[PDB]
Design a protein around this nucleic acid. Structure first.
Length: 418
DNA sequence: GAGCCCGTAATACAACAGATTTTTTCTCTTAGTTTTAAATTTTTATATTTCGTCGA
DNA sequence: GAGCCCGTAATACAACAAAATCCAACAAATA
DNA sequence: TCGACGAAATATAAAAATTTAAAACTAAGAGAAA
DNA sequence: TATTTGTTG
DNA sequence: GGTGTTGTATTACGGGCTC
DNA sequence: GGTGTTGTATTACGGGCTC
């Protein structure tokens, strides 16, 4: 039960094979590509096709007619003759030692994008699927605020359990919100610690139940506060707070190495140390990014001046304007530097309407659902809206899934074939 | 240089790195409880609505 | 080219990516 | 085809006196999701 | 001799 | 509307000397 | 004695044409 026991006088290679035969030319519809290929063969000298008793082949490899292309690549890709659904390299190593197939690599990668199980099972670095495209930089001071918290720490005396952080996107000002892992009184403690400065414009946070929080969201809609609400298991958007708790974790380890179970005393020292230390992407201390009144003043900084903003009373407007201008251009510099050092391999994905994208078992099933060697056979979903440049909402075929926003790091767009 | 086709063929990039239950609120869904007010009678004069009928 | 000192100063590279239970099973420690 | 009347339906304020929902109010039970 | 308790894929 | 982001050793580029 | 390692899209380099 072997193949190639069939003559085909109507295919692309007929023009190539009549270079010796010159007998019959029964071309088909859309066979004008064969005419152009024969013209290119005529103006060049690459004649290596061998014609031996109906076996027309290349120098050592069997050229296959285009009628049975899919049959051959399915035979050497599926388990009919022990393929195994591998990549283009193993498929070439199975086919190219035996067959030639002009533009074989493009045909094989097209088949990889065609075969459904390879789309659902393979990953092929599904963490580089969209550009960086960071947050818009800022406005006037204390208008954008980043919100997140680490769920659990070694508990203190039974009054405090975990640390919440507030750092603004502009100035990156540390904060010490020590919660109890909380209730609807989140707005009480949160209000007491941001309203020390004032009400922001948008909150960059995750889809956490203390902030998804239909009771708390309506408060923000009434008050005039937006909510970015980073999607399920995509904590990258929170950013400044995540980077702060990275710096806080080192600081908390430093100040509580031998002093576990009472770190709530040292937490204001943690935030004050974070506040007094200059950063890199802005080059100035977060006091200086705000009203520059580093109160410790161990020594005067470089370019010695008055450096006493307490003496200035009415002229603070020009000083804050100057700080705002230089910090805004520094934020733009940080944005472009991040975009340069990150997008060296980040391939974009821009669809925005009418596709059948997937979600490869991350933010689709539960974060608490165990990942194992169980098959990854998420069905072909649909996309109806372009919610952002780096995400697309889906019509999750479930009860509700409680969210339908999927960042591009889980999509891996499905492609059909007739 | 300058590009193009195509055919091979190198090429850095990332996955294998014990896996699962909890922890703390929240938010639909769906079955059980509780307090309370309401379906047909007398009735009494008042008035207006809407049928219902009758008359020349 | 050719290298060196020194003084700044850019520069990719990785950490924040929820936290903490055991599962199964080796061998030490008493009583 | 305009006039002429009869008559149930309500409120009404009590005392009452058996059945019927019936919608707030709890309380599992799943499903999220840092 | 059963119930522990260090560490490790 | 809504989607990364800085801390850190490490390393690259100008004044001043030998040319 | 004892300590990474390949699968995979992706991309870079020679024959043959225009020069």
């Amino acid at each position: 039960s072997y193949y190639k026991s069939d003559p085909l006088c109507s295919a692309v290679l007929i023009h190539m094979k009549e270079l010796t035969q010159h007998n019959v030319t029964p071309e088909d519809m859309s066979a004008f590509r064969s005419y152009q290929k024969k013209l290119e063969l005529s103006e060049t000298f690459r004649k290596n096709y061998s014609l031996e008793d109906e076996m027309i082949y290349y120098q050592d490899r069997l050229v296959v007619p285009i009628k049975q292309q899919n049959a051959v690549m399915r035979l050497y890709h599926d388990h009919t003759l022990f393929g195994g659904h591998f990549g283009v390299t193993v498929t070439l190593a199975k086919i190219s030692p035996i067959y030639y197939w002009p533009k074989l690599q493009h045909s094989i990668i097209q088949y990889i994008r065609t075969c459904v199980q390879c789309q659902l099972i393979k990953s092929h670095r599904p963490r580089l699927h969209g550009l960086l495209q960071p947050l818009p930089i800022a406005e006037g001071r204390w208008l954008d605020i980043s919100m997140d918290f680490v769920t659990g720490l070694p508990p203190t005396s039974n009054n405090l359990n975990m640390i919440l952080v507030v750092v603004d996107r502009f100035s990156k000002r540390a904060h010490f919100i020590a919660t109890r892992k909380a209730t609807q009184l989140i707005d009480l403690l949160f209000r007491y610690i941001f309203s020390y400065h004032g009400f922001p414009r948008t909150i960059t946070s995750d889809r956490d139940v203390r902030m998804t929080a239909d009771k708390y969201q309506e408060l923000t809609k009434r008050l005039g506060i937006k909510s970015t609400m980073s999607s399920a298991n995509h904590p990258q958007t929170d950013g400044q707070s995540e980077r702060t708790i990275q710096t806080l974790n080192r600081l908390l380890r430093a100040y509580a190495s031998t002093n576990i179970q009472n770190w709530h005393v040292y937490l204001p020292q943690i935030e004050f140390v974070y506040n007094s230390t200059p950063t890199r992407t802005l080059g100035k201390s977060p006091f200086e990014i705000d009203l520059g009144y580093l109160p410790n003043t161990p020594a005067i900084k470089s370019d010695d001046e008055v450096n006493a903003r307490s003496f200035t009373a009415v002229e603070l407007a020009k000083h804050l304007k100057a700080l705002t201008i230089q910090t805004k251009e520094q934020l733009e510099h940080a944005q472009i530097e991040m975009e340069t050092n990150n997008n060296q391999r980040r391939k974009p994905l821009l669809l925005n309407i009418g596709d059948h994208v997937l979600v490869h078992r991350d933010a689709y099933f539960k974060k608490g659902a165990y990942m194992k060697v169980q098959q990854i056979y998420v069905g072909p979903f649909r996309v109806v809206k372009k919610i952002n440049d780096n995400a697309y909402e889906l019509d999750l075929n479930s009860h509700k899934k409680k969210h339908r926003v999927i960042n591009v790091q889980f999509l891996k767009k499905f492609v059909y074939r007739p």
